[PDB]
Amino acid sequence: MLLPWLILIPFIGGFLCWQTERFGVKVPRWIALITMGLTLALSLQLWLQGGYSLTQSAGIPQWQSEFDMPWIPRFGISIHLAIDGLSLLMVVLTGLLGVLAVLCSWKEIEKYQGFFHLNLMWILGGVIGVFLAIDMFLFFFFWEMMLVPMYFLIALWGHKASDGKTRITAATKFFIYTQASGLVMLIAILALVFVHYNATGVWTFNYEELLNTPMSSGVEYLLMLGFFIAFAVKMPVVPLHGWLPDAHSQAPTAGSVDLAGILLKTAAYGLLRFSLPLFPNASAEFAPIAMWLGVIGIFYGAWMAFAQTDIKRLIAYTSVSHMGFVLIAIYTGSQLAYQGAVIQMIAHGLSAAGLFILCGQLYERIHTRDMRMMGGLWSKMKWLPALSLFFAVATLGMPGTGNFVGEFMILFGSFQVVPVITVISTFGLVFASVYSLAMLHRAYFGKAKSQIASQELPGMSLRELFMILLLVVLLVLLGFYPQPILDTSHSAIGNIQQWFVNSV
Amino acid sequence: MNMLALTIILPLIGFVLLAFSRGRWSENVSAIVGVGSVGLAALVTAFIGVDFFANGEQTYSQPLWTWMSVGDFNIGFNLVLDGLSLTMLSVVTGVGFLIHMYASWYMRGEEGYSRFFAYTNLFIASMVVLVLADNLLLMYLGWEGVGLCSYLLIGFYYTDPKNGAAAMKAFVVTRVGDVFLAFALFILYNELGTLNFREMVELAPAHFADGNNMLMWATLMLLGGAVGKSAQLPLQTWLADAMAGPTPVSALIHAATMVTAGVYLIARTHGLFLMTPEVLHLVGIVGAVTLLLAGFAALVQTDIKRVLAYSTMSQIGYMFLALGVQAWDAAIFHLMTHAFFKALLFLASGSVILACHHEQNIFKMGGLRKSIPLVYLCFLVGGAALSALPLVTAGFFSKDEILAGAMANGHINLMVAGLVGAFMTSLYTFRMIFIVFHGKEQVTHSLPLIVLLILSTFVGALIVPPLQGVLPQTTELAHGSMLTLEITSGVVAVVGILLAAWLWLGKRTLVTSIANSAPGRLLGTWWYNAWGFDWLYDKVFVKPFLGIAWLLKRDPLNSMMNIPAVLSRFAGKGLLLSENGYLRWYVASMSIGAVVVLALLMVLR
Ligand SMILES: CCCCCCCCCCCCCCCCCC(=O)OC[C@H](COP(=O)(O)OCCN)OC(=O)CCCCCCCCCCCCCCCCC
Ligand SMILES: CCCCCCCCCCCCCCCCCC(=O)OC[C@H](COP(=O)(O)OCCN)OC(=O)CCCCCCCCCCCCCCCCC
Ligand SMILES: CCCCCCCCCCCCCCCCCC(=O)OC[C@H](COP(=O)(O)OCCN)OC(=O)CCCCCCCCCCCCCCCCC
Ligand SMILES: CCCCCCCCCCCCCCCCCC(=O)OC[C@H](COP(=O)(O)OCCN)OC(=O)CCCCCCCCCCCCCCCCC
Ligand SMILES: CCCCCCCCCCCCCCCCCCCC
Structure with a gap:
C-alpha cells in the first residue's frame, strides 16, 4: 500500500519543487529535503512494521508487502510492487543517499534549480521503483527512466570548469552504454515471456509466474547473458566500465548526482533478484566466468585507481573494484557470502558517498582537482583531511567500518565455495590498501606542490560537517553492530540462496 | 574482574576526545587526557591482575554483543583473560603509560600533539583488543588497528615525504602479512566451523584425525601473519625504514605493541601449532635466521635507531626460536624483559637526539658520557640487558631460559645459532655504545x-609470568647441563663485550683495516642494505607494479570498447559518400538496387 506512495512521492515532490521556483529561488531545495525526508520516514516506518528480524525463509515468492494494479492488460502488464528485506534495505539506503544529495546541493542558488531538483527527484524515484518493481516490464521501465534526468544533469549542470563538449561526450557515452544494455535486457524479458507463453499459454510479465518456466539449456544461457550484460554495464564489470569515471569526472561539482543514482547498486539487486532465481542453471554455469570477471575487475580497478591523477576517477575505480568483490560474492551460492555482499553494498555506498562529498568540498575550497597541484592539505584545512583519511581507511577494508565486515563475509563464503578466487581477491585487498594510501599521500600529505595549497582554506559549515559525521557514525555502527542489517535481509537472501541451490 | 572492557573503553575515549579537540586544547590538558587514559587503563589492568590472582588464576570471559550471526558463522565481541592475556595486557599498559609520560615531556612545543596522543591511544586500544580477544576475528580487528596506528604514527611528520613513503611501505608489508592471517582465518573457519581459540583446540584433533594438510596450511598462514607483524622472514624489511618516525612511536612499536603481536599469535594458538610439528620447526628456523641476519646487519649500521631496529629484529627472532623449541614461558618472559629494556634504549636514544642537535651519524658523536651521564648509564644498562650480561640483567635470564628450552628438546643447531646471535648482539651493542659515548667531544621524563x-636489571627478572595452566611447561634439564649452558652463555657475552672494547674503544685501526678492505667493503654494503631484501622486493614487486600501472593508465579496455564507436563513425563517413547530390547517380543507384533485388529474388526462388 505504501509502495506506490514510496515511488510517486519523489515524483510529486519533483513536480512541486519545479513549480515552486516562482515563489523564490531558495524554495525548491527545502521542498526536495522535505520530500526526501518523507520518503525516508515512510521507508523507516515500513522497516519498523515489517518485522524483518523475526521473518523466516519460506521460498520465493515471499513479500512482506505487495501492490498490484493493471497497466497494459493486453500483455498481462501491471504496475506490481513488492517489498522484502533486501529491497527495503536498498530503498532505505536510497532515501538516505537522496537526503545527502539534496543537502549537498544546498548552496546552489542558480536560476534553474527547480529543474535540477526535479531531475534529482526523478532519479531517486526511478531507483526506488527499480528496487520495488517485481513486474519485468515495469522494472525495465524504471531502469531506463532513471537515466534521462542523469543525462540532463551531467550534460547541463556538470563540471563548470570543463568545456561543454566533454560533458556531452561523457553523458552520451553513459546513456548509450546503459540504454543498449537495457535494450538487451528488454529482449531477454520479451524472449522469456514468449517462452512462458509457448509453454503455458497465458500472457504475463510477472516475476512470480516467470520463475516456474520449462526450458532447455542454451536459450536460458543466452537469456541470462542478456540480463548479465545489462547488469554488468550497470554494475560496472570490466570492460564495460569507462562510463563510470567518464560520468564521475564530468558530474556536477556538488557530487549529488553520484549519490542519486550512481552509488545505488541496482545491478547487484537485479543479479540477486532476477538473474539467479529466473535462470539458476545458466547462472551456475556462468559462475566461473563471473568470478574471474570480478577478479579482473578488482585488479584492473586497483591498477587504474593507483594510476589516476584525479580524485573522482580514483573513487570510480574503487567502486569498480568493490563491485568486482560483490560480483564474486553473488555467484558463489553461499548465504554468508550473500549477506556479506549486502553489507558491502551498503557500506560501499556510504563510504563512496563520503568520499565524493569530501572531494566536492575540496574542489570548492581549492578550485582544482589534479593531485599534482596540491599536497600538505592537513595543515591548511580544518576538518576535511581527517574525515578524508577516515573514509579512505574505510574503503581499504579496515575493521571498525562496514566495508571490512562485508567483504570479509564475502571472502569467507567464497573460500567455502572457491578458494583460488578468494585468495586472489585478498591480494586485491592488498592492492586496495595500496591505492587508498596513494590517494592519501598524494592529496593531503607532503609539501604543497602549487600556490593554492600553500595558503589556508576556509573550513566546513555545520551542514557539511553534519552530513559527513552522520556518514561516519553510520559506517562505524555498521562496522561494529551489523546485526540489524543482517537480520533484516536474512529472509530474502535465504529464499534466493535456497532457490539457487535447490534447482542445480 | 568486570572492568575488562574499560581497558578498551578508556583509550578509545581518549583517542576520540583528542581527535575531536583538533589541537584547540592546551598542551597540558591534552597531555592530561592522553596520559590519564593510558594510566587509568594501567590501573584497571593492575586491579584486574589483583582480582585474577585473588581468585586462583581462573580464565575469565566477558561477552558484550554478538558481532556477526549468519547460520553457523557466529562471531562475538567476547573478551577473554588468562595468564598470557593478563601478562601482555600488563606489559602493554605499563610500558605504554611510561612511554606516554616520556612523550608528554618529549613532544612539548610540537605541532600535532593532540593528534599524536590520539593515535597512540588508538594504538593502545587496538593492542588491548588484540590481546583480549577470544576469537580470531576480534583479534584481526585489533591487528588491523595496530597496523593502521603504526602507519599513522610512523608518518607523523607528514611534511617530509620520506616519512610518508616509509609509513606506506610499512602498511603494505603488514597488510600482506595480514592477508596471510586472513588466509589462516578462512581455512580455520572452513574446516572447524568456529573462530574461538578454545573451540579450535577442542574440535581440531577430531576433525583432523584423517587428514592434516588443511591444518598445516592454516598454521603456515598463521606463521606468515606472525612474521608479517613481528618483522621476520620474509616480511621484515619495513622496520628499518619505519625508524623514520618519532622516538616514542619507535618505543611503542618495538617494545609494547607491534612486534609482540606475532609472538602472541604463535603462543595463543599453541595447540594448533603443536598439531603441526613441521610448522613449529619452521618457526624456530625462521627465528634463528632472522636473529642471525639482524645481528649481521646491525654490526655495520651507522645510526643508533637502525641498530636498535635490527636488535629488535634479533630479539624477536630469539622469541620465535623459543616458540619453535616449545619454550613458550621463556618466549613470554623474554617478551616482557625485551619490552622493558628496548623501551629504555629507545627513550634514551630520543633523549640523546634531543640533547645533541639534529640527527647525526654515530661517527660524528664521541665522548658523550661526560655531557649526558644519566642517559649514558641508561644506555649502559639497556645494552647490558640487550647483550644478556650475566647476573645483573633480566635479559640474561630470559635468553638463558630460551637456550635451555632449545637444547632440552634436541634443537642443537638453534642453540648454536642463538649463542652466535648473543655474541653478535654484544658485539654490535657495545660497538654502538663505545662509538657514540667514548672518544673526543665534537619530573615527567625522569620517572x-x-x-x-x-x-x-634482575628486578625485571623477579617478575614471574603467570603462565601455568595456559601454555605447556618447558621440559626440565639436568642441573649440571643448564649450569654449563649458563656459563657458556656468560662466557659468550663477556667475550663479545671484550672484543667490542678491543675493536672500537681506542684508535680503530683493526676496524678500519677490515672496513676499508674490498671484501670488507662488499660485506658491509651487503649487510647495511638489509642483505638486499629491499632491493629484491623493489625489483620483484614494486617495479612491475609501477610498470603495469604506467602501461594501464591509458585504460586499454576502454579503447577496446571504444572500437565500435570509431567503426561506426568511419562507416557513416563512408556511407555519406553516396549522397553526393547528383540525380544521375541517384537513378543509377535505383537501377543498381533493382538488379540486386531482382537477382537476389531469382537466386533464392
Ligand atoms: C560486452 C560486449 C557485448 C555486449 C554489448 C552491449 C552493448 C552495450 C555496452 C557497450 C557499449 C559501447 C558503446 C561505445 C560508444 C560509446 C559512446 C561514445 O563514445 O560516444 C562518443 C563518440 C564521439 O566522441 P569523439 O571521440 O569526440 O568523436 C568525435 C565526434 N565528432 O561517439 C561516436 O564515436 C559515435 C557513437 C555512435 C553510437 C554508439 C556506438 C554504438 C555501436 C553499437 C553498440 C552495440 C554493441 C556492439 C558490439 C559490442 C562488442 C561486442
Ligand atoms: C557495426 C559493427 C560493430 C557493432 C556490431 C558488432 C556485433 C554485435 C552483435 C554481437 C552478438 C552476436 C550474437 C550473439 C549471440 C549468438 C547466439 C547463438 O549463436 O546461439 C546459438 C545457440 C542457440 O542455442 P540452442 O543450441 O539453439 O539451444 C537449444 C538447445 N537446448 O547458442 C548456444 O548453443 C549457446 C551459446 C552461448 C553463447 C552465445 C553468446 C556469446 C557471446 C560472446 C560474448 C559475451 C561473453 C560472455 C559475457 C562476458 C562479459 C560481458
Ligand atoms: C547486439 C545486441 C543484441 C544481441 C543480438 C540480438 C539477439 C540475438 C539472439 C540470438 C538467439 C539465437 C537462437 C538460436 C536458435 C533458434 C531456433 C531454436 O532452436 O529455437 C528454440 C526455441 C523455439 O523452439 P521451442 O519449441 O520454443 O523450444 C523451447 C526451447 N527451450 O527458441 C525459443 O524458445 C526462443 C529463443 C530465444 C533465445 C534468446 C534470445 C535473446 C537473448 C538475449 C539477447 C542476446 C544475448 C545477449 C547479448 C549478446 C551480445 C550482444
Ligand atoms: C619471497 C616473497 C615473500 C613475500 C614478500 C611480499 C612483499 C610485499 C611488498 C613489499 C614492498 C612494498 C613497498 C611499498 C612502498 C610504498 C611507498 C613507496 O615507495 O611509494 C612510492 C609510490 C607513491 O605513489 P605516488 O605518490 O603516486 O608517486 C609519487 C612518486 N613516487 O608508491 C608506490 O610505488 C606503491 C607501490 C606498491 C607496490 C605493492 C606491491 C604488493 C605486492 C604483494 C605481493 C604478495 C605476494 C604474496 C606471496 C605470493 C606467493 C606465490
Ligand atoms: C541502511 C543503513 C544502515 C546504516 C548502518 C546501521 C547499523 C546498525 C546500527 C544500529 C544501532 C546500534 C547502536 C545501538 C544499539 C541498541 C541496542 C538495543 C537493544 C539491545
Missing part, C-alpha cells in the same frame, strides 16, 4: 627512565 632503569 619512566627510572622505572625502565630498575626493570632492565
